[PDB]
């Protein structure tokens, strides 16, 4: 009664007609009103093979979130002056949604790493509301593992492959650029909360690597974009030094709250295509956002050898992985 396939989905949103927010405005064209009564349908006894790492829904969310930016976000200076105005910018949740002749299958397996057979399979006609949060290193307000923690990877042994971890407990980040150096801004994270989780990982990480010590590390090198947790607030790009997050020590004796430095940049590397873009600078006003760390992205050194332990460090930059962190559980399947 069905086979795997790919087709041009459609999006839906609770977007509002006249707010000037860039996400609302994009989706007012592009998307359709949201369904008042969306209906899930648990399926008989059907067992399906999902594969979050080869999912054409990812490639589609990507296309959108790109168009959404290079369009809403106007630089100064041309490309390849342009006048760079200041625009409202908070992402709203976008539902993706099958058209006629296809449906979406959903894995309800609680502990599941978007790969292999599923068994507890549902049928939505529209995914959940996914906010298109573009960021690095950390995955911000979004899904969250219902039961234990989940380590996603296309192949763990190939150190080359990004590792996505799905947190089962959220943790807030309080990032602020106060209302007067203006380019200087910071983030705060309740320390004792965060560490239990990191501890809570490692363990759940150690499980996947033979009870051998799990060591963290700063990133080896590359663009400021990946070396540092990059993200956007109210239109402003933040670059945060996460050396304090992976602070092996604070775990025996230690203390409470954590604080990251973070700088705002106006000359950044595009995530959308190879190049650079200039945006106008901030405004003496206060700029704050507060995200749930719903998960994080790691790489592994391979390296070892093996000594007797594994080294892990921040990664990201391939934004399709952010879309995967949510889309892992859905897949498009045709009927006709």
């Amino acid at each position, epitope marked *: 009664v069905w086979k795997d396939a790919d087709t*041009t*989905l*459609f*999006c839906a949103s609770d977007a509002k*007609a*006249h707010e000037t927010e860039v996400h609302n405005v994009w989706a*007012t*064209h*592009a*998307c*359709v*009103p949201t*369904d*008042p009564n969306p209906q899930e349908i648990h399926l008989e006894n059907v067992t399906e093979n999902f594969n979050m790492w080869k999912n054409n829904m990812v490639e*589609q969310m990507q*296309e*959108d979130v790109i*168009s959404l930016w290079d369009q809403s976000l106007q630089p100064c200076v041309k490309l390849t002056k342009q006048a760079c105005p200041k625009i409202s910018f908070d992402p709203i949740p976008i539902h993706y*949604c099958t*058209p*006629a002749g296809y449906v979406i299958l959903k894995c309800n397996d609680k502990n599941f790493n978007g790969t292999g057979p599923c068994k507890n399979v549902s049928s939505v006609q529209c995914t959940h509301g996914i906010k298109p949060v573009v960021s690095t290193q950390l995955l911000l307000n979004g899904s969250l593992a219902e039961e234990e923690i989940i380590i996603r990877s296309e192949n763990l042994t190939n150190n080359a492959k990004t590792i996505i971890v799905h947190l089962n407990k959220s943790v807030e980040i309080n990032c602020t650029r106060p209302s007067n150096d203006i380019r200087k801004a910071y983030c705060e994270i309740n320390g004792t909360k965060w560490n239990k989780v990191l501890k809570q990982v490692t363990e759940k990480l150690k499980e996947h690597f033979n009870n051998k010590t799990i060591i963290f590390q700063p990133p080896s090198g590359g663009d400021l974009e990946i070396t540092m947790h990059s993200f956007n607030c109210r239109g402003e790009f933040f670059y945060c030094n996460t050396t304090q997050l992976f602070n092996n020590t604070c775990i025996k004796g230690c203390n409470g709250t954590i604080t990251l430095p973070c700088k705002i940049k106006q000359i950044i590397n595009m995530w959308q295509g190879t190049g650079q873009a200039m945006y106008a600078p901030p405004i003496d006003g206060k700029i704050n956002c507060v995200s749930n760390i719903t998960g994080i992205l790691l790489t592994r050194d391979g390296g070892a050898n093996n000594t007797s332990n594994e080294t892990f460090r921040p990664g990201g930059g391939n934004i399709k992985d952010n879309w995967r962190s949510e889309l892992y559980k859905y897949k498009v399947v045709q009927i006709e």
Partner: antibody
Amino acid sequence: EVQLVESGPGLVKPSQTLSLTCTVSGASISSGGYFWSWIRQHPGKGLEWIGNIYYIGNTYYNPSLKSRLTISVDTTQNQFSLKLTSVTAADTAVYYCARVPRLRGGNYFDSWGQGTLVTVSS
Amino acid sequence: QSVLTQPASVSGSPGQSITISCTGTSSDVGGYKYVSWYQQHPDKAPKLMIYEVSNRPSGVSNRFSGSKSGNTASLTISGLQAEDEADYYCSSYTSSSTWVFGGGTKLTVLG
């Protein structure tokens, strides 16, 4: 699959109300993903967009017409219709039926009906 | 709710190429990549031929192509033939929140 057919009176008197209905073969919902449009062509002249409606109650109209215009989704929804109050000989036109649709972008009138002529005098 | 402006008429000859222009504003064509093109033929219904500035529906020649720079989009036809002689209409979405067709250009194949 997916044709459309305009059903209704072909004559209306001035100061009266004009009303037509379209009939699907596709599934006004659904399927998708898609809006449902009314569009008209006074003969010898061009196209004028009249309105759009979504399977929910959403309606999008021509600023020119907003005082004398409504669109609806009927019988289980299925089929949608045009109601256009107080008219003149300028409301005479061949009224087409069209689907949009809007997947992720493209906003573009397809599945065109064959249209029905509606003449206006007393 | 503009009116969108196309030249009343154009003309070509077999094998030839020719483009019809569509000019609007920074809110229609400006604006969004939602410019659509239609062929009429007296006396039949309109036929979609280009959507989203430059895309084609399956079953429309390669002769039809769509372009757009700034607030003007254009339809190019190549290897012109008789069966092209028709009215061609332009349309676009519009900021908030409507569509609007163009006047219409009459294609006259000469010779």
